[PDB]
Amino acid sequence: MREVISIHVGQGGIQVGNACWELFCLEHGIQPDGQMPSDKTIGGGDDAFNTFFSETGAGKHVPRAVFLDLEPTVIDEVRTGTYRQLFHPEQLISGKEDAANNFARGHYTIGKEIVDLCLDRIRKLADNCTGLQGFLVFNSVGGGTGSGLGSLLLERLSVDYGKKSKLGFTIYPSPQVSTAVVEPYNSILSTHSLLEHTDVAVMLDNEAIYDICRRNLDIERPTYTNLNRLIAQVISSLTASLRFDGALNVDITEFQTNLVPYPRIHFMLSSYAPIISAEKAYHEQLSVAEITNSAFEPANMMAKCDPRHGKYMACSMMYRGDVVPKDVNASIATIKTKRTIQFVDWCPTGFKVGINYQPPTVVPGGDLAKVMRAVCMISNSTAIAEVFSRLDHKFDLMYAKRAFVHWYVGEGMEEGEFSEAREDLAALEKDYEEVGIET
Amino acid sequence: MREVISIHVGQGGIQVGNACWELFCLEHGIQPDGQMPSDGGGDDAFNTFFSETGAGKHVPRAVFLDLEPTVIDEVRTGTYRQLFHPEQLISGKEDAANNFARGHYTIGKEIVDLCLDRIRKLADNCTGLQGFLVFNSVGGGTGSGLGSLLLERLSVDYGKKSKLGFTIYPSPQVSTAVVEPYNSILSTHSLLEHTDVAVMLDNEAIYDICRRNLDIERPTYTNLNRLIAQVISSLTASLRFDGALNVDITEFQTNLVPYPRIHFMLSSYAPIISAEKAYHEQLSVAEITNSAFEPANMMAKCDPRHGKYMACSMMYRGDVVPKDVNASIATIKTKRTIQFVDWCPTGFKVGINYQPPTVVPGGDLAKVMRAVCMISNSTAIAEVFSRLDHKFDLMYAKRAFVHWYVGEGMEEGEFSEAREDLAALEKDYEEVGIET
Amino acid sequence: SGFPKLPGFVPTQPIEQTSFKRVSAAKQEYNRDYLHKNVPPVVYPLPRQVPPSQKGMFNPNYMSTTHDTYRPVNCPNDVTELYQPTWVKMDRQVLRFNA
Amino acid sequence: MREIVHIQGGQCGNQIGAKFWEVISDEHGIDPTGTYHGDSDLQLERINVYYNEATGGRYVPRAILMDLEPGTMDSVRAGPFGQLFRPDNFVFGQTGAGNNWAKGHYTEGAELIDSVLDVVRKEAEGCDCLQGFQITHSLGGGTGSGMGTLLISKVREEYPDRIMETFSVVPSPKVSDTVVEPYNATLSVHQLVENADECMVIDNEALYDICFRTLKLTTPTYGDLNHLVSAAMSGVTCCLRFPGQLNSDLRKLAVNLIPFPRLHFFMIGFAPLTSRGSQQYRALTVPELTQQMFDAKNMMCAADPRHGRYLTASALFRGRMSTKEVDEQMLNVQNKNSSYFVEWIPNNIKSSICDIPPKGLKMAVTFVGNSTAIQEMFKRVAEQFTAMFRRKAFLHWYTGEGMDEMEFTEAESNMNDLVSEYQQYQDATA
Amino acid sequence: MREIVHIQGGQCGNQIGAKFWEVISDEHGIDPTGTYHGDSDLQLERINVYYNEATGGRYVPRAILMDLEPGTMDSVRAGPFGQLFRPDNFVFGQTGAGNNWAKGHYTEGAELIDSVLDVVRKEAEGCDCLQGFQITHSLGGGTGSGMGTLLISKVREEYPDRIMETFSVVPSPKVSDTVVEPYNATLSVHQLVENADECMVIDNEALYDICFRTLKLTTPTYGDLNHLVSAAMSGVTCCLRFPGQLNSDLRKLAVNLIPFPRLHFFMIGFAPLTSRGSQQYRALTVPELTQQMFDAKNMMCAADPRHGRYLTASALFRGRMSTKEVDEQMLNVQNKNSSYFVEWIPNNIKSSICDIPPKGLKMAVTFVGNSTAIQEMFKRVAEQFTAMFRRKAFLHWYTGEGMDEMEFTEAESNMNDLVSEYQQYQDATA
Amino acid sequence: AGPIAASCYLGKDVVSSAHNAFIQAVSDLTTLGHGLNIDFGFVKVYVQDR
Ligand SMILES: Nc1nc2c(ncn2[C@@H]2O[C@H](COP(=O)(O)OP(=O)(O)OP(=O)(O)O)[C@@H](O)[C@H]2O)c(=O)[nH]1
Ligand SMILES: Nc1nc2c(ncn2[C@@H]2O[C@H](COP(=O)(O)OP(=O)(O)OP(=O)(O)O)[C@@H](O)[C@H]2O)c(=O)[nH]1
Ligand SMILES: Nc1nc2c(ncn2[C@@H]2O[C@H](COP(=O)(O)OP(=O)(O)O)[C@@H](O)[C@H]2O)c(=O)[nH]1
Ligand SMILES: Nc1nc2c(ncn2[C@@H]2O[C@H](COP(=O)(O)OP(=O)(O)O)[C@@H](O)[C@H]2O)c(=O)[nH]1
Ligand SMILES: [Mg+2]
């Protein structure tokens, strides 16, 4: 009686949803065509899978997910891949014309005609669930249709459903590595749009995860697939508590009431440990103290942000495996003792712990090793102001000469929307500065 | 001892009547020749649409009319030649050609006499005739003119007995003729004062229903008939099958007609899921009902949201237990996107029939275990009357095409009175909806 | 098998049943008394009998749209013989004996 | 002796009938053929109560079926136990009512009284010492309330000394089946207050409320809802048909539950009921019988029995048990809940014990009570009626077949007055 | 006789239920199936104190399980001894808690409280002579505190004389189990102090501290911590159930342990405890028993017991023992540690004897005493509470469900006031 | 009757019963002879023996 609905919009959203849904299918023992494995014959399966899948009455399972995009290439690839029989035929909404990195296009001209179909599908999905915990959204911010439709659907869902919690695993551009040229524009516009419309936003820039892959997985030529696999592993570690018994359970609702001190401050950066290639795992003993100290390594952050430059506001970490509470306490005390990691003054208690019994599952053909212990760490810190400052500087460097603006002003959005977004970002930086001063 | 005699006029009426008859044939096991294999016995549910001849075959209590003989002949030479009474498929010698005045004052009177005699005999055998089902097309001259005259005489001779008509007005933007605005408007006065209940069946709305769900990009009129075929199937199915909660034909003009003038209600149908993927969703009564109110599935092309609902009565057929229906009905009230009029607190007439929906051979509809049909009279219906309003006024501005009606014996001034009837009808719809 | 009759002890919805046609009160006696020791007499054969018409031309290219869709349903073929009641076929037949 | 004859009206009346006879037939041991196979002498001791002897050994119900459309009398005689209703008494016209309180009570019903009135009189002439009549009729159904009330209006005209009982199924507010439900709701009620000795209110909303929460069965049916009600009516008169400690005839029920002439509506229910998963883990002792009897969720009515105060109540113990706990336990309920019981009617609970238990169990109890809460039902029905009448909505269907809207206004005044009068004593004190 | 009922809330509240009935079930000898295979009548002389009776001899827990989220409740069902509880006693919501007191005390828990109050009222009235309640809820959770405390508040209003037993779990700063724990803690105490009679504060630190320095075991789960506490609960309730030298129920414990009306926070511990590798050399005698009972490190509250002055304490020995060797020991301790006990109450330690030791052992002890050392907990919570409020951080949520600011200011003053009084006795001299 | 008892200021109930008493034309017509003329306004009703 506890279910979640995931929203995947944009090319990045679809390509990460594929990696998420292969892992979810593998973890519950559901083969790609939707049915239980034919011989099976153990009998009496416990239906944990209700959280992500839906029973059709006799046979296959239909996932509670919807894919959105305006270009048909990725959707056709999904409909022709191995998972063609898994998803419902009419929940893979596709358009005809691409957004072409233009935020105004997918937010004012062509994105408006897809939002009605998407909202209808969401409504038809919601009534099936009885314990709907909340919504999850995946979207690449540095893109046209991604940011545009993400902002539009979030705006509509904020009024259509109201108090239901929403979580966003957005992907901001790297500090210096980027594929587009106008990404700061739609990045800032989307950040302004979702600032007052999303409960939790997680930093997921690609450069940091590339560094993680190179340093730990011993892969010198990584591709997007490894990136999506790590993201899916993080999703699984986050949502494992809803379908597997554990010593101390946590819910989706017990996340955004513990990491949000003030409503404007809801951006945080993630971390995961251990991320080790078997070549080395064989040598170490991967205990719980080691993994919890590795979770706090600044080089192990999932975002290109240095926590050593700022204070911590609230830190939440979830464990899974054969961890015992006493060792978790002993490690948390040691971390609190350490001097290089400091918290904000008005937050004496800054840890929440989740304990689960199910060890992480291993996907065949993956890079990660099979281990008995792992931790997923989500913390809010003051150090996130630097990425906003850098993005504002990059935006200003172009906006001083009004470059590329005609591509935006000609498609329905007024000249002044850039200025108000800049003011909102300035206010965000001001708030992040004020929150950290000692009383 | 229940009898309903079907009256058809016009190719739209005949082909729709043609298609709906195969559906009624298969359901009761009636072979095309007219002899039931059967074998027990009893189960005389086929009486509702058939009459025993004392010993042997059975016949449909239907009359087919038309002025252009070609259409009727095809049925007379098709597969079903062995079913209908030879002397009930009246045909003329000339057509009307959309000159509604032609079908009302010139050519019709040479056929009205025989048609009235036919309706005389068919009812004579029955015992408790509930009423008539009249299927016709208003977007045509010969059909409408006979369609008009027949309606007038039914009230005069019989009076209080029920009458139902599934008219098909022209589409919002898709039209087959260019004189429909005259024949569409002038019919309204004919059908507003004489028929208790009538339903809209705008064609281009169905094309949306077929295209959106069945996944057929090249439909034809024949498939359009079938969807209409099921609609009549569920409304009358309560009268020839046992169930936990029944409904009667007479019990519709007393739950969907607040006043004599306002007697236009819209239909909807679901589920319509292609068998290609029909079993990727659970077909639960909870999900089925929601599809009923969905704006995208409305049978007639009008957005129901623009106004308020007055009274909607839904008929259930399948294995739905009333426990499910009570819960789901509550949900429809809760939603903040659908609202009811101020002065109608209770507006549901719920009916249930155990018999599942029959899937005809050669069709497109898949086989499902539950279905519900909605017949509702909503303020949104103003759109159809709003849109026809502009067309009649504009094209009448400079007396275009009037000269074909003046010379046929129809008074020029009569069109003066007709326009008001819409005005009189148009004002009431807005008048009722305002809050008190 | 005389199970204790109490509420909620015997399910009612007969999922195993298929046909639910309504038998009228008029023939209710018809299926219990009349047809038990009676028969609509017979369709017997005949000793001397000594075939429908051609129907050989059914071109598919000239197939009218209103016919190619509504093919004969529930019939192996679109038969042509004109049904007649039992009494019709057997008019004026007789048998004889001496005793 | 002192037997009764039943008159059922409307489709809802017929279907509800299809069950109690079946259950009534079950307790007496009457096989479908009419051939007796009971085990003890008791089942045949009082067979006159609901059957008359016919040569051939099979027993004729004193049933009279009335409905304006033939279908109901058709299906009722087709299924199980449908052949016990003997064909002579069936009465049906040719038209049907169409939920038109006008159609079934002045237009068609007025034309038909002749035959049905003739048959009922004869059957009453058959009984040795008449006791009364029971009726099943649908208030929300045009024909039931229409044909039903007239006869009830007619019946009291000639049997001045016979108690009259009427089970009523008024439409609940939550889930509605007919749009004309409000109108026909008041008209039948207005005529119901002036003629019926006892009318019982049962809300279909509660039943489904009863089924999901107590029976916990996945897929109910109207047969199940019929099942529940059918048991109750057998509950009221059970003790009369069998020997027992404290015989309590239906009339005695009238004595102890009607405070004043115009307050003649009660609320009833049947228990105990167990689940598919709780039948083996509950308790079977007297306290359980009393605990569930007054529980809010068990009363078949939509009105919560706590929004007001019980003017009077009666509990008819069925089966063997120590009378000590029957009387004492009631003394348990009365004292701890004085505020919910008016303070000028001391010892305001009736009790009775019957020695024949239901087939398959040890203890049983049926409950009948007149509570102030019933005001909730009439107000919402009353409130709805005013909503539609101010706009003359759907007025023409009733105006064009002999009626004037003055009667509708007249009906409201009486119905409103009863609601006002019924609540006058709640604020009254001694 | 003088039986009690149990209600538990929250995952910590629920979890203890799975173990709590496990040990209690075995003490009287109840199997997973629940049938009685007890050997001696000493296991049934007072069985009704914790069980009812039904058909077949199956005995059902007097259980009431309630929560906001079903997942934790789901797990408790499938384990061992997960079949004793009956479904009717269960209740569960649909939105969850979110560790936010507001959603647990004003908006969400408001709607569901009706069922629990109804279910709680069903059990109490049935019992012969209700003696009290035992509430096991967690202060560190949203649904725990919110629904929990509000449950304690409401109950007192309807019942004048019922005694209360409350077992809580205060969060220690080291193990920060919830950042919102400080705010929740202060709110819980504020409501608690006004209605809770007896509360036993157990620090999770001691459970962890106990698991390492007392039992000397490698890898304990929350079952062991759940195991440790469960012994304490049965430790106090046993005397009311079995024969003994000086019978003493819970209330008899209260009169000797609360010196003033609202200094009623106690401190509990268990003994004797020893490891697998260290439980062979020591000698098992009460003189060795008492030694481990007073030692501070073993006490199950992070508040050091040597930093304060004991006011009142009680001793509940288990198993057989002569009066001498227990009483003389107790007199010995009082004199030899004079400086640690207040001067204006002589002979301020209570002792009692229970005639049935725990199964598998020879002697054990359960201790409960009112010591000023508990002042360490509230202030440290007190200091933390003020820290987060001076910046209003996280204050918005509580204001998002109808709450308002002056509630927090009022609560803070009282807790600051409660600490104020509990120390003025420490320096008081005669 | 409805709006008739209000027409002549007489009780609603009596009128209906009064209607039945006059209704029995048969009883006064079943016997022999006794021709009648019941007009009461626009139309007249006449009867011979039968
Ligand atoms: N981490 C990750 N990022 C991706 C992936 N695919 C695309 N992106 C990001 O998406 C950005 C460009 O937008 P796209 O995802 O390609 O396309 P879009 O967001 O749907 O917007 P349109 O191009 O208008 O369709 C790039 O800068 C990438 O950073 C992926 O598979 N993994
Ligand atoms: N639903 C449906 N309507 C049809 C179909 N074919 C024609 N119509 C309707 O018929 C209208 C025009 O009238 P006709 O088809 O000419 O029939 P008529 O009104 O009797 O006029 P005549 O053809 O001269 O007899 C069009 O506007 C259509 O709406 C069909 O196959 N299905
Ligand atoms: N619970 C229950 N209610 C019924 C049943 N049959 C009819 N009703 C009620 O009767 C109403 C419809 O009455 P209707 O059939 O129109 O009465 P009619 O005029 O005699 O046909 C519905 O609103 C139902 O609430 C039944 O079997 N069970
Ligand atoms: N010792 C112990 N503490 C527990 C257990 N389960 C939960 N807790 C406590 O409960 C607190 C978290 O509260 P939470 O689970 O959110 O309570 P809930 O919201 O009512 O379910 C933690 O600080 C734990 O100390 C358990 O099995 N043992
Ligand atoms: Mg034509």
Short mmCIF file of C-alpha atoms in Angstrom, two decimals, chain D residues 216 277-284 288 291-292 306 332 336, chain E residues 53-55 58 60 83 85-88 118 121-122 125-126:
data_model
loop_
_atom_site.label_atom_id
_atom_site.label_comp_id
_atom_site.label_asym_id
_atom_site.label_seq_id
_atom_site.Cartn_x
_atom_site.Cartn_y
_atom_site.Cartn_z
CA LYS D 216 -15.34 -8.51 4.96
CA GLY D 277 -11.17 -14.32 8.97
CA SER D 278 -12.64 -13.51 12.38
CA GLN D 279 -15.36 -16.15 12.82
CA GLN D 280 -13.02 -18.38 14.84
CA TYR D 281 -11.24 -15.81 17.03
CA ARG D 282 -14.12 -13.76 18.44
CA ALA D 283 -16.01 -14.58 21.63
CA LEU D 284 -19.38 -16.27 22.07
CA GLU D 288 -20.67 -9.94 22.82
CA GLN D 291 -21.68 -5.07 22.74
CA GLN D 292 -22.45 -5.23 19.02
CA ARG D 306 -25.48 8.79 18.89
CA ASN D 332 -25.17 -2.47 32.24
CA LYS D 336 -23.30 4.04 31.78
CA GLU E 53 -10.97 -16.37 26.71
CA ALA E 54 -12.64 -17.62 23.52
CA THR E 55 -13.84 -20.87 21.96
CA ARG E 58 -7.22 -20.12 22.26
CA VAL E 60 -5.82 -13.75 22.51
CA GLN E 83 -0.40 -14.64 14.94
CA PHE E 85 -3.14 -10.42 17.72
CA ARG E 86 -6.61 -10.20 16.21
CA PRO E 87 -7.28 -7.97 13.19
CA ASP E 88 -10.05 -5.97 14.85
CA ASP E 118 -13.57 3.16 19.99
CA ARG E 121 -13.17 1.59 24.79
CA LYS E 122 -14.32 -1.85 23.63
CA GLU E 125 -15.48 -1.99 29.49
CA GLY E 126 -15.40 -5.73 28.84
#
